[PDB]
Write a protein of this length. Structure first.
Ligand code: HEM
Ligand SMILES: Cc1cc(F)ccc1O
Length: 137
């Protein structure tokens, strides 16, 4: 289930983080409005860019802690508040997060592994709800 999936992702997190983020950028190319340094680069070129690997790992590091602190795929209000109030998230809306979770769920469904894709879909929907409640537009 969901908790085992956090363990699975954490066991190879740099790789899963980059492949999920690439699945997001490739599914939703207009999302690069917020990542202008990633325009005009293939996946292998992005993996070679220091901030692509180091920021994407740090994003998934924190996402796995928010997932781990959740109860039944519902994040802590303190985690939602932190994600709204981060200066690096000043430009964002809940739709940016919805699209990331649609890509993460599609990636899990396409894998041969017994990921609990239904739980990740609920987590993404519950995180969006919590971000809205904490004041993200
Ligand atoms: C649960 C989901 C997310 C978590 C846990 C999270 C966490 C983080 C963290 C920890 C950073 C700091 C990275 C660093 O400076 O090394 C960061 C930066 C940033 N995050 Fe988020 N984030 C999430 C979702 C998103 C989404 C969906 C977007 C946009 C589609 C976004 C846009 C950014 C941007 C633009 C930065 C700064 C630019 C950059 O770091 O390259 N984040 N986030
Ligand atoms: C900055 C960032 C945001 C995400 F949502 C995914 C990967 C990243 O490097």
């Amino acid at each position: 289930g969901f908790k085992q999936d956090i363990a699975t992702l954490r066991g190879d997190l740099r790789t899963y983080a980059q492949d999920i983020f690439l699945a997001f950028l490739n599914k939703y190319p207009d999302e690069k409005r917020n990542f202008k340094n990633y325009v005009g680069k293939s996946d292998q070129e992005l993996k070679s860019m220091a901030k692509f690997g180091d920021h994407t790992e740090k994003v998934f590091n924190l996402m796995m802690e928010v997932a781990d602190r959740a109860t039944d795929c519902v994040p802590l209000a303190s985690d939602a508040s932190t994600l709204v109030q981060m200066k690096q998230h000043s430009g964002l809306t809940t739709g940016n997060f919805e699209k990331l979770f649609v890509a993460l769920v599609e990636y899990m469904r396409a894998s041969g592994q017994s990921f609990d894709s239904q739980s990740w879909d609920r987590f993404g929907k519950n995180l969006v709800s919590a971000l809205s409640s904490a004041g993200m537009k």
